Write an enzyme that holds these catalytic residues in place. Structure first.
Site, PDB file in Angstrom:
ATOM      1  N   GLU A  74      -0.036  -7.132  16.005  1.00 19.92           N
ATOM      2  CA  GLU A  74       0.882  -8.088  16.608  1.00 19.92           C
ATOM      3  C   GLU A  74       0.502  -8.409  18.068  1.00 19.92           C
ATOM      4  OE1 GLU A  74       5.413  -7.164  17.757  1.00 19.92           O
ATOM      5  OE2 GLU A  74       5.202  -8.150  15.836  1.00 19.92           O
ATOM      6  N   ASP A  99      17.016  -9.908  10.656  1.00 21.46           N
ATOM      7  CA  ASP A  99      17.567  -8.633  10.122  1.00 21.46           C
ATOM      8  C   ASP A  99      19.025  -8.657  10.429  1.00 21.46           C
ATOM      9  OD1 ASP A  99      18.550  -6.066   9.565  1.00 21.46           O
ATOM     10  OD2 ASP A  99      16.707  -5.152  10.371  1.00 21.46           O
ATOM     11  N   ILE A 134       0.887  -1.185   0.000  1.00 26.99           N
ATOM     12  CA  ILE A 134       0.000   0.000   0.000  1.00 26.99           C
ATOM     13  C   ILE A 134       0.899   1.201   0.000  1.00 26.99           C
ATOM     14  CG2 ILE A 134      -1.830   1.274   1.292  1.00 26.99           C
ATOM     15  CD1 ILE A 134      -2.454  -1.657   0.185  1.00 26.99           C
ATOM     16  N   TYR A 140       5.065   1.185  -0.376  1.00 23.53           N
ATOM     17  CA  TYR A 140       5.512  -0.194  -0.203  1.00 23.53           C
ATOM     18  C   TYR A 140       5.431  -1.044  -1.470  1.00 23.53           C
ATOM     19  CZ  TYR A 140       6.353   0.368   4.863  1.00 23.53           C
ATOM     20  OH  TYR A 140       6.828   0.730   6.149  1.00 23.53           O
TER      21      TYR A 140
HETATM   22  O1  LIG Z   1       2.316   2.390   4.181  1.00 28.23           O
HETATM   23  C1  LIG Z   1       2.324   1.168   4.418  1.00 28.23           C
HETATM   24  C2  LIG Z   1       2.651   0.624   5.679  1.00 28.23           C
HETATM   25  C3  LIG Z   1       2.612  -0.770   5.870  1.00 28.23           C
HETATM   26  N1  LIG Z   1       2.310  -1.617   4.784  1.00 28.23           N
HETATM   27  C4  LIG Z   1       2.227  -3.123   4.918  1.00 28.23           C
HETATM   28  O2  LIG Z   1       2.140  -3.436   6.352  1.00 28.23           O
HETATM   29  C5  LIG Z   1       3.322  -4.218   6.637  1.00 28.23           C
HETATM   30  C6  LIG Z   1       3.863  -3.935   8.109  1.00 28.23           C
HETATM   31  O3  LIG Z   1       4.407  -2.620   8.172  1.00 28.23           O
HETATM   32  P1  LIG Z   1       5.921  -2.393   8.273  1.00 28.23           P
HETATM   33  O4  LIG Z   1       6.722  -3.384   7.462  1.00 28.23           O
HETATM   34  O5  LIG Z   1       6.109  -0.927   8.052  1.00 28.23           O
HETATM   35  O6  LIG Z   1       6.109  -2.667   9.797  1.00 28.23           O
HETATM   36  P2  LIG Z   1       7.502  -2.989  10.491  1.00 28.23           P
HETATM   37  O7  LIG Z   1       8.105  -4.222   9.983  1.00 28.23           O
HETATM   38  O8  LIG Z   1       8.480  -1.772  10.298  1.00 28.23           O
HETATM   39  O9  LIG Z   1       7.169  -2.946  11.912  1.00 28.23           O
HETATM   40  C7  LIG Z   1       4.253  -3.809   5.546  1.00 28.23           C
HETATM   41  O10 LIG Z   1       5.206  -4.809   5.237  1.00 28.23           O
HETATM   42  C8  LIG Z   1       3.417  -3.734   4.313  1.00 28.23           C
HETATM   43  O11 LIG Z   1       3.128  -5.076   3.872  1.00 28.23           O
HETATM   44  C9  LIG Z   1       2.012  -1.130   3.552  1.00 28.23           C
HETATM   45  O12 LIG Z   1       1.743  -1.885   2.591  1.00 28.23           O
HETATM   46  N2  LIG Z   1       2.018   0.293   3.359  1.00 28.23           N
HETATM   47  O1  LIG Z   2       6.986  -5.045  19.796  1.00 23.38           O
HETATM   48  C1  LIG Z   2       8.385  -5.113  19.810  1.00 23.38           C
HETATM   49  C2  LIG Z   2       8.763  -4.461  18.495  1.00 23.38           C
HETATM   50  O2  LIG Z   2       9.960  -5.018  18.098  1.00 23.38           O
HETATM   51  C3  LIG Z   2      10.574  -4.101  17.235  1.00 23.38           C
HETATM   52  O3  LIG Z   2      11.900  -4.562  17.200  1.00 23.38           O
HETATM   53  C4  LIG Z   2       9.876  -4.195  15.948  1.00 23.38           C
HETATM   54  O4  LIG Z   2      10.406  -3.286  15.038  1.00 23.38           O
HETATM   55  C5  LIG Z   2       8.493  -3.777  16.151  1.00 23.38           C
HETATM   56  O5  LIG Z   2       7.845  -3.929  14.940  1.00 23.38           O
HETATM   57  C6  LIG Z   2       7.818  -4.588  17.255  1.00 23.38           C
HETATM   58  O6  LIG Z   2       7.644  -5.943  16.766  1.00 23.38           O
END
Ligand SMILES: O=c1ccn([C@@H]2O[C@H](COP(=O)(O)OP(=O)(O)O)[C@@H](O)[C@H]2O)c(=O)[nH]1
Ligand SMILES: OC[C@H]1O[C@@H](O)[C@H](O)[C@@H](O)[C@H]1O
Ligand SMILES: O=c1ccn([C@@H]2O[C@H](COP(=O)(O)OP(=O)(O)O)[C@@H](O)[C@H]2O)c(=O)[nH]1
Ligand SMILES: OC[C@H]1O[C@@H](O)[C@H](O)[C@@H](O)[C@H]1O
Ligand SMILES: [Mn+2]
Ligand SMILES: [Mn+2]
Lengths: 271, 271
Positions: free
Chosen positions: B228, B251, B54, B57
């Site tokens: 989550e 990561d 979205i 992304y």
């Molecule tokens: O503007 C956005 C924000 C989030 N996402 C979707 O929601 C998922 C989870 O968000 P993100 O990866 O930003 O979370 P993070 O891994 O940083 O916590 C992303 O992988 C995308 O699949 C998206 O499509 N557009």
């Molecule tokens: O809630 C703990 C958090 O851990 C971070 O390291 C991660 O970036 C977040 O997305 C969340 O999962």
């Protein structure tokens, strides 16, 4: 509240606790029974236990049932099915609540025809239980045997062979036999004295084994360890979803009590 | 022919390979993929992979799909479902045989409404796939991710928290929230970026999570880590049948490559 599992501290480091097709191998220290019991009680699980006591083997029923009442699926619904040629010889053992016993009168071949016998009874087991557990009668329960074993299909490691290489396994080696397994094939050697699963999977196994024994009969060959040979060929081709460790099938007289067995759960009675 | 598993020699002694409710924890060295592939191919298994891309992304899709073609369920039937607000931005990536891609045009809330979105589509997923796998798009496949993960319900260990004690876990701690988990409860901390299961179990989870988020909205509270948080409360009450190790969500930039990770399979792309 229960102890937190910690991913970098395994509880058992001494033994294989998962098969290579990701079926748990059930050892003490691998399971939290409080979690498992809750999961199974939420489904109102009913466990069927089948045992054959033909001819002199009726003598083994009193201890078998008494010790089952102490250790087998306690807290869960249990239906014992006792196959016997002598219904009046079945001891009247007092059972815990939610537990019942049925006597089914029946007529190498005694051990072998169990597969046949477990599979008429077909619709009766489907309506009455969720799982079926199929054991030898010349045994006693000495410790907990519970819902940790339950799964679609399980077998049990033969206590003579769990430390051995596959070439030593006494599989059927004659290509003539439906039970045939080549010398470089095979995961484990399972004992015929303790197997089970969902009613559907157990009916499939017992039907398959019976069909394969008939084919051998019509071909003039009897597999080397009989039903256990066919059980081993079935479980090679249709891998069990749990494997029980030798805690679940042991003989202290013959094999002692090694350190790797934290509990001796289900053991042979001298005959 | 494959290596014989030996019950007195575990392959991994360094890590927990089974949960206390007897769900495999999936690490390299626990599985023989040749066995698993055969089992899954005999059922003509089809795996659905859902990904949201979205706004900005969409930029992550080319690498995500290219690397999925190299590593994700290779040999099996795969149906990618790409949820996006920009259908014309989806890159045309060449796919292997038995693999297809559908584009589904869609309208804290973007990450959160995925549960809602995974659950319309309800009958479409039921007819089209056997399993559903739900991942973040800002990721790349670096190594094998295959049928070892498949099971009725799975979650994945959060890579920040697999060595930690439960008191450290960033669960929702406000009793006001449907996501609430007390300080002395909890098995693991699962990451929202990789979960799945059978279509039925995934529809149940996503429906449950969506229902619980709505209840929180109608109560003026937003769980601390959003979807989550709810995912973690669901998986506490309905325990997964497999748990993926952090090989499956890592990561390298932030966490390196520790010895306990034999393979880094699915990793974050810098953003
Ligand atoms: O503007 C956005 C924000 C989030 N996402 C979707 O929601 C998922 C989870 O968000 P993100 O990866 O930003 O979370 P993070 O891994 O940083 O916590 C992303 O992988 C995308 O699949 C998206 O499509 N557009
Ligand atoms: O809630 C703990 C958090 O851990 C971070 O390291 C991660 O970036 C977040 O997305 C969340 O999962
Ligand atoms: O005359 C017999 C022989 C065998 N059995 C049943 O078949 C099982 C397997 O036989 P047995 O225990 O003799 O085999 P073993 O364990 O010595 O190989 C027994 O437990 C009984 O349940 C029986 O009921 N009557
Ligand atoms: O086939 C190997 C054999 O192992 C013996 O120890 C056992 O008594 C037999 O019943 C059979 O299982
Ligand atoms: Mn016996
Ligand atoms: Mn992400």
């Amino acid at each position: 509240v229960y102890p937190q599992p910690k991913v970098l501290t395994p509880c058992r480091k001494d033994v294989l606790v998962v098969t290579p097709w990701l079926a748990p191998i059930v050892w003490e220290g691998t399971f939290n029974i409080d979690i498992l019991n809750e999961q199974f009680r939420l489904q109102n699980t009913t466990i069927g236990l089948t045992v054959f006591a033909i001819k002199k083997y009726v003598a083994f029923l009193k201890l078998f049932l008494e010790t089952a009442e102490k250790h087998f699926m306690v807290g869960h619904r249990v239906h014992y099915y006792v196959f016997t040629d002598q219904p009046a010889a079945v001891p009247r053992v007092t059972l815990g609540t939610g537990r019942q016993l049925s006597v089914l009168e029946v007529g190498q071949d005694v051990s072998m025809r169990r597969m046949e016998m477990i599979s008429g009874c077909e619709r009766r087991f489907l309506s009455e239980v969720d799982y079926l557990v199929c054991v030898d009668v010349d045994m006693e329960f000495r410790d907990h045997v519970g819902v940790e074993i339950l799964t679609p299909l399980f077998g049990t490691l033969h206590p003579s062979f769990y430390g051995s290489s596959r070439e030593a396994f006494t599989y059927e080696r004659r290509p003539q036999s439906q039970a045939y397994i080549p010398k470089d094939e095979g995961d484990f050697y399972y004992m015929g004295a303790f197997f089970g699963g969902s009613v559907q999977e157990v009916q499939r196994l017992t039907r398959a084994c019976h069909q394969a024994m008939m084919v051998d009969q019509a071909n003039g060959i009897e597999a080397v360890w009989h039903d256990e040979s066919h059980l081993n060929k079935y479980l090679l081709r249709h891998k069990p979803t749990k494997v029980l460790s030798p805690e679940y099938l042991w003989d202290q007289q013959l094999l002692g009590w090694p350190a790797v067995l934290r509990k001796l759960r289900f053991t042979a009675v001298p005959k």
